[PDB]
């Protein structure tokens, strides 16, 4: 309850720089603001996609895990609709709301009149071949539809557990849970692949890659555990994990965070050996954006200090069993991947290693902040680690 | 060893399995054809136009020879020195072989013409061999 | 926890005979495979 | 429900499991000899189709010039990926601490090791000169190569070699302490010293068990990855290569996933049987065929995802390569196993959502064996289908199999079978430890509720 309270306030004071530095972002250049709003918007939508997905993801295996950060991701995936209305700026910005704003094109490319229309100026054949899936009614529409259901799912199943408190639960209420769970897994697989693909991959539309979206699912699943792992760290002392929880769900969980971050390099290199061995142009350019012009150093970085440490610090039981280091650990894995998302969206519109600024380092943090301060305002609204539940006694062992 | 991987990644599909026994093991007047200066493939292995490789390799050590009985050290070969077979038999002298490094060779000189394209460029693999494109002479009464 | 054979006197002379089995058997197909044509 | 049925103890547990071996050999049932029998004549089968494609050649199958890789390959994916969801069992639930495993995973350990056998044949014999096989392999010689290494053949020859390796391994540390049990009760003198040099003379114990569980948990940690990323190889050698239906980014995650989804419906299809014949009713629950059947339905709509992909490649993409792709896959010659595809791999898989589909046995099996042929389907539009149709349409042809790829395949079936019979008879079918070890966690839970 109280350290709860404490991370709620860093989080609005860090939202708080966060709204001051993209407001002078939109005083300066307002298409710097949008482009970092774009980024800002993707790895704060890291947090509550993967804390719903993941609730899910319990909810279908029941585990002592599960039970131990239930709360806090029913916590995460209460956020949705915020995330909606943080959306809508970028709705706005890819609109017919443009031509006001300052912006001097739209912030995608399909949203651009000339390069999708026939008989244009620009008349881009790829760009334009895309036109009924990449038009705005048809983007807002689809990522409006995608808020429905994540915010159904998250708010039923929320609901649900909310109900769990009084009775009607070691059989009723959790197959209900179980239901919902089992087919919204596939619901939350599909839509947030086509999520990841109209936010990011739609960006550059010359360049597609399938394995997409499961690169931003493992990217949201393992920003989502070393969350849930910081905060666990936190939230030590409020007497209920101090009753019912143990050392063994920190070590499941930092168990997960440990495979959530191979199988991320997993995907990462499986599309990185695709595209690099089998060397056809329409593949290609993705990576020569990233690594020409100082990129390179950043995915060299990105490689050494968000595998090869992660992985080699994570072999052990302490830093796994003990929760301090833990944390640690996690708060690195939640920086690096900051720095991966900053390597996978900002080189469709920075184009320099240098060409970063003070925006893209204020969207991601305030935008962070912003979720973070929803997420612990939601936890405090219910008592966490639900005590009434058939799945409890993996608690005990 | 025959795995045939080569065969699906070559964009052109220009390779040649040896699936079953092709070549004439037993005739001997079959045996009489074969030239010396190329093998005779076994079943289970590759095969595809090597810029018919013997000739190269022949003309290669006739330069070598000839450069170091003069004792030059340089190996300059001539672009009249290679003649491909599929060159040399071509009535309407279509193909056209040499090195393109070198800009006085005919093959040079017909590259850097605007027409000239290399087959299926999306994927990137550089063609050697490249093509000039068709450009057709009609008439202003049955086209324009 | 230790082996079941770690204070045995076999310990220290068949540890030896891994090793002087590695230096033996490894190069001769060292010997074999590089100077021997 | 419960995973254990009650009414059991460790005399009765190692009753029940330990004396399907160590019978009689002429007091063995007359269902095993039919099955034997079979399994044997399928052998032959495959015999005299390998003696006819090493005496031939590798012309014998319907590969031409497009499709350099027909069926073969495809019987490779297939037979590869048929050992997924075995060392999912063996390993991977090992590691998320699943109560389901612990009567499957001997099974499943021997099926993953005979269909790598079954599998690891095909990169041999689709050589066409078999005997350089060896060359893939980095081995000392007079020439100096060295394997290309960047090849996915390349590294597919250390990653089926790992593999089986690894899956041997983890069978025999699986095996000792079972072999110290059917040594303690063999009851012929020379049998006790056949299993008592397998166990080693195990002598159950603390400090031995303890490295047990930890060398257990711990290989568990390492095929875990391992598993994975042979089967991305297996996906990298089409996912590396420029035809357009094989560069696809999202092959090696779909390639895992039809590979647990295969490998499951193959598990289903050997152990309703098991379970039924052999009476291990108690020790394999309905409910461990109710979780079974869900985590085949996890996978069947990842590779329905995956068949979603593909067909999001081809129609966002304004390449003609993959929009002529989907359409000679939807409208082409070979179309009908892409209809058959979709039929099968995500028509029938949608009934599995249903709790009474699930524990219905008889809709179970049946629907684990349209999953097997529709897998196989999925292959054949992968590899075939593509590379019938390629970047210059001289160089499109069709693809007709010959008698000796099936052949070939129902001797591969024939070899798996036999290796599963020999299996079932001399060694136990489910973990003997483990479930004891299972029972002692069943009545703990009972204990401390
Ligand atoms: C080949 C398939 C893909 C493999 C992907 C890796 C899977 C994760 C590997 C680590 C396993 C889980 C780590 C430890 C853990 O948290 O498990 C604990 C829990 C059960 O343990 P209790 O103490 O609670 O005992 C309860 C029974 N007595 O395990 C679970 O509940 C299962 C967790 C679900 C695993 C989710 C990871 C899968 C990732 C998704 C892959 C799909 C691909 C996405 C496109
Ligand atoms: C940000 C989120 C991360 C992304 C997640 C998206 C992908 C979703 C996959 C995860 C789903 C896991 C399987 C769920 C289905 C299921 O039924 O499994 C749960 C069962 C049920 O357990 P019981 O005993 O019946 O309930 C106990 C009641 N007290 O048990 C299991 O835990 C088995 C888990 C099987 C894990 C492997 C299969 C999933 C991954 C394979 C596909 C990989 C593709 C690359
Ligand atoms: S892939 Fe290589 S192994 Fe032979 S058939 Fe081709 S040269």
Not at chain 1, 19 to 31: E, N, R
Not at chain 4, 90 to 96: E, G, H, P
Not at chain 4, 230 to 259: E, M, N
Not at chain 4, 375 to 392: A, H, K
Request: aromatic share 16%; hydrophobic share 50%.
């Amino acid at each position: 309850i109280p350290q709860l309270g404490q991370v709620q306030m860093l989080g609005l004071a860090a939202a708080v720089i966060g709204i001051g530095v993209l407001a002078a972002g939109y005083f300066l250049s307002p298409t710097s603001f949008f482009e970092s709003y774009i980024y800002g918007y993707y790895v704060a939508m890291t947090i509550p996609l993967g804390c719903l997905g993941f609730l899910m993801v319990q909810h279908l295996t029941g585990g002592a895990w599960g039970v131990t950060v239930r709360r806090m991701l029913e916590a995460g995936a209460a956020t949705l609709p915020i995330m909606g209305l943080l959306f809508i700026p970028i709705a706005l910005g890819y609109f017919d709301t443009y031509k006001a704003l300052g912006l001097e094109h739209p912030l995608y490319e399909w949203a651009n009149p000339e390069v999708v229309t026939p008989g244009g100026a620009e008349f881009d054949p790829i760009i334009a071949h895309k036109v009924p899936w990449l038009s705005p009614l048809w983007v807002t529409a689809r990522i409006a539809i995608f808020f429905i259901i994540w915010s159904a799912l998250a708010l039923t199943l929320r609901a649900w557990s909310r109900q769990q408190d009084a009775g009607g639960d070691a059989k009723k209420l959790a197959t209900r849970m179980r239901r919902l769970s089992g087919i919204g897994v596939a619901l939350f697989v599909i839509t947030v692949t086509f999520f990841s693909f109209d936010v990011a991959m739609s960006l550059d539309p010359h360049w597609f890659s399938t394995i997409y979206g499961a690169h931003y699912m493992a990217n949201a699943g393992l920003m989502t555990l070393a969350f849930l792992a910081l905060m666990m760290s936190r939230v030590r002392d409020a007497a209920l994990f101090r009753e019912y929880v143990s050392v063994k769900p920190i070590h499941d969980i930092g168990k997960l965070i440990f495979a959530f971050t191979v199988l991320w390099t997993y995907m990462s290199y499986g599309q990185l050996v695709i595209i690099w061995s089998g060397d056809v142009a329409e593949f290609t350019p993705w990576y020569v954006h990233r690594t020409q012009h100082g990129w390179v150093f950043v995915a060299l970085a990105l490689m050494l200090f968000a595998f090869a440490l992660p992985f080699f610090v994570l072999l052990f039981r302490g830093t796994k069993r003990n929760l301090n280091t833990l944390a640690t650990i996690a708060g690195w894995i939640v920086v690096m991947r900051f720095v991966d998302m900053a390597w996978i969206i900002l080189p469709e519109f920075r184009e320099h290693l240098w060409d970063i600024a003070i925006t893209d380092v204020a969207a991601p943090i305030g935008l962070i902040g912003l979720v973070i301060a929803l997420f612990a305002a939601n936890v405090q609204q219910a008592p966490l680690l639900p005590l009434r539940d058939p799945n409890m006694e993996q608690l005990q062992n | 060893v025959g795995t045939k991987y080569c065969s699906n990644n070559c964009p052109y599909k220009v390779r040649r399995f040896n699936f079953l026994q092709y070549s004439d093991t037993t005739t001997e007047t079959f045996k009489l054809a074969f030239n010396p200066d190329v093998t005779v493939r076994i079943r289970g292995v590759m095969e595809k136009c090597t810029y018919c490789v013997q000739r190269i390799s022949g003309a290669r050590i006739a330069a070598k020879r000839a450069a170091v009985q003069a004792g030059q050290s340089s190996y300059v070969i001539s672009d009249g020195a290679i003649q491909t077979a599929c060159e040399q038999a071509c009535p309407t002298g279509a193909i056209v072989f040499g090195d393109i490094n070198d800009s006085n060779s005919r093959v040079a000189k017909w590259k850097a013409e605007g027409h000239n394209y290399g087959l299926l460029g999306f994927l990137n693999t550089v063609p050697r061999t490249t093509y000039l494109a068709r450009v057709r002479n009609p008439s202003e009464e049955l086209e324009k | 926890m230790q082996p079941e054979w770690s204070g045995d006197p076999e310990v220290k002379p068949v540890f030896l005979a891994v090793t002087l089995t590695g230096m033996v058997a490894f190069l001769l197909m060292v010997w074999l495979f590089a100077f021997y044509w | 429900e419960a995973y254990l049925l009650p009414g059991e103890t460790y005399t009765s547990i190692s009753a029940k499991i330990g004396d399907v071996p160590l019978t009689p050999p002429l007091k063995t049932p007359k269902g095993w000899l039919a099955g034997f029998s079979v399994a044997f004549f399928m052998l032959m089968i495959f015999f005299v189709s390998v003696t006819w494609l090493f005496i031939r050649g590798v012309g014998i199958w319907g590969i031409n010039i497009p499709v350099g890789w027909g069926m073969d390959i495809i019987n490779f994916v297939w037979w590869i990926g048929i050992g997924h969801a075995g060392t999912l069992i063996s390993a991977i639930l090992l590691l998320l601490n699943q109560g389901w495993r612990n009567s499957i995973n001997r099974f499943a350990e021997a099926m993953t090791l005979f269909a790598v056998a079954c599998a690891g044949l095909y990169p041999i014999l689709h050589l066409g000169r078999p005997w350089l096989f060896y060359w893939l392999i980095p081995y000392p010689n007079t020439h100096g190569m060295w394997p290309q290494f960047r090849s996915a053949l390349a590294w597919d020859v250390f990653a089926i070699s790992t593999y089986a390796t690894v899956s041997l391994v983890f069978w025999l540390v699986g095996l000792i302490p079972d072999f110290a049990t059917l040594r303690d009760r063999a009851k012929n003198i020379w049998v006790k010293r056949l299993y008592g040099i397998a166990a080693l003379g195990w002598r159950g114990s603390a400090r031995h068990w303890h490295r047990y569980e930890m060398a257990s948990i711990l290989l568990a940690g390492l095929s875990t990855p391992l598993v994975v990323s042979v089967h991305s190889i297996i996906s990298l050698d089409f996912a590396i290569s420029q035809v357009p239906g094989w560069q696809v980014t999202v092959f090696p995650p779909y390639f895992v996933a039809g590979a647990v989804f295969a490998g499951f419906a193959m598990v289903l299809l050997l152990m309703i049987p098991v379970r039924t014949f052999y009476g291990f009713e108690n020790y394999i629950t309905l409910h461990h065929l109710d979780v079974m059947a869900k985590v085949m339905l996890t996978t069947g709509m990842i590779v329905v995802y995956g068949y979603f992909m593909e067909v999001f490649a081809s129609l966002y993409s304004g390449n003609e390569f993959e929009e002529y792709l989907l359409y000679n896959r939807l409208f082409g010659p070979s179309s009908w196993a892409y209809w058959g595809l979709l039929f099968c791999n995500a028509v029938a898989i949608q009934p599995l959502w249903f709790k009474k589909v699930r524990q219905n046995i008889p809709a179970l099996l049946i629907i684990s064996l349209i999953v097997s042929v529709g897998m196989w389907l999925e292959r054949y539009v992968i590899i075939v289908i593509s590379l019938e149709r390629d970047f210059l349409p001289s160089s499109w042809d069709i693809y007709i199999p010959t008698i000796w790829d099936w052949s070939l395949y129902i001797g591969t079936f024939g070899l798996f079978f036999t290796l599963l019979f020999l299996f079932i008879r001399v060694l136990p079918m489910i973990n003997i430890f483990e479930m004891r070890l299972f029972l002692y966690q069943e009545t703990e839970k009972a204990k401390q509720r």
